[PDB]
């Protein structure tokens, strides 16, 4: 019983891994990411 509880702990850990990858993927695909503000920052620094 304790081994089939720790296998469920492993499955819980794998679904936390999948959720962390979904969060990273959301921060990369989104529009207001690092790249948008990077281009806007450099472009406004030039204009300024």
């Amino acid at each position: 019983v304790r081994r089939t509880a720790t296998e469920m702990q492993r499955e819980h850990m794998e679904i936390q891994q999948a959720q962390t990858q979904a969060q990273l993927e959301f921060l990369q695909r989104k529009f207001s990411n690092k790249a948008l503000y990077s281009w806007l920052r450099g472009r406004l620094a030039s204009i300024y």
Binding site: W39, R41, G42, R43, A45, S46
Partner: protein, 97 residues
């Protein structure tokens, strides 16, 4: 007997150096690749359109760097505009042919 000796010493040194610097062999390959160019990308055409437009980059040196610097440091995702200013200097002082 001698150049094999030196070769094994070279491989041991580079392997221990890559383990201490926490970087793999493939990243070192990308550090040392000869370019052998091809057609530019669409992001390249964005970059060339953005430098081509905007203010004309000044013909005086040390002003060329500080005018070209913010778009280059945007295009490389570097931290500071002065870091991207000195990057053009470091590729200008020395670079492969």
């Amino acid at each position: 007997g001698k150049t094999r000796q030196k070769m094994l010493s070279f491989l041991s040194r580079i392997t221990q150096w890559l383990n201490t610097q926490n970087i793999t062999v493939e990243q070192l390959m990308l550090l040392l690749d000869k370019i052998s160019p091809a057609a530019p990308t669409k992001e390249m055409q964005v970059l060339l359109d953005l430098l081509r437009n905007g203010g004309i980059d000044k013909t005086n040196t040390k002003t060329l760097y500080t005018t070209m610097a913010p778009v280059i440091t945007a295009a490389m995702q570097l931290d500071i505009t002065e870091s991207g200013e000195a990057l053009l200097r470091w590729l200008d002082n020395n670079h492969p042919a």
